Design a protein around this ligand. Sequence first.
Ligand code: NA
Ligand SMILES: [Zn+2]
Ligand SMILES: [Zn+2]
Ligand SMILES: [Zn+2]
Ligand SMILES: [Zn+2]
Ligand SMILES: [Zn+2]
Ligand SMILES: [Zn+2]
Ligand SMILES: [Zn+2]
Ligand SMILES: [Zn+2]
Lengths: 17, 112, 114
Amino acid sequence: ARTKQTARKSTGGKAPR
Amino acid sequence: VIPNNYCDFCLGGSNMNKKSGRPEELVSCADCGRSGHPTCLQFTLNMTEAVKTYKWQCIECKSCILCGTSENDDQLLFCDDCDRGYHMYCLNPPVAEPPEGSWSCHLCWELL
Amino acid sequence: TVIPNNYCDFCLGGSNMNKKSGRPEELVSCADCGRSGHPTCLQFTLNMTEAVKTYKWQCIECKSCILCGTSENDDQLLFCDDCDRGYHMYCLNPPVAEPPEGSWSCHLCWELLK
Ligand code: NA
Ligand SMILES: [Zn+2]
Ligand SMILES: [Zn+2]
Ligand SMILES: [Zn+2]
Ligand SMILES: [Zn+2]
Ligand SMILES: [Zn+2]
Ligand SMILES: [Zn+2]
Ligand SMILES: [Zn+2]
Ligand SMILES: [Zn+2]
């Protein structure tokens, strides 16, 4: 199963706005 | 909400995914305009299709379909088939912890 | 032929009970060796489950590259994120030197969109 935390780890960080 | 024309993960536009070295489309959050290449988002083709059928939310805006909040976001499951978010405690019956195997939501199960 | 196993390799439950989820669930079975698994135990999505039922799906042990037909260099197989078919990185067009950072799906699955 996927959570917010596994999703963040899976994709790496997001650019700032 | 104007969609961003670059990918949050790789900073490439629709003409260049900087991780794959190929052009690739962008999908964008309905709430804040953050965008990403489907492959950078780790989406399957079928998930990419699915997120085009509803007001998809980025990882940061994602709110539980059942209660409407993005609070207790440690307790959110993201459906493996459509990316919708659900709190483990909002599911009926509730679960204490993420299932070991793949997990998809009731809406996806009913399609089938 | 090949006799499908009546139990899941990950939880030893039959179709009547997935012992992880505590619910009944269909088994899928390898076309070559008959070893079986609950799709959820296999980490398959609902849509992958439907795709693997449309062709002679092979388990991780039996996977051969679709393109060249061999199971040599099994460490270089990429597995499609939509259908679980295996493809040598060097058999792809263009070939690649290493696995993609992102997700990846095969040409046959892209065609099915059209
Ligand atoms: Na894969
Ligand atoms: Zn990207
Ligand atoms: Zn957003
Ligand atoms: Zn909720
Ligand atoms: Zn779903
Ligand atoms: Zn099982
Ligand atoms: Zn096998
Ligand atoms: Zn090959
Ligand atoms: Zn495929």
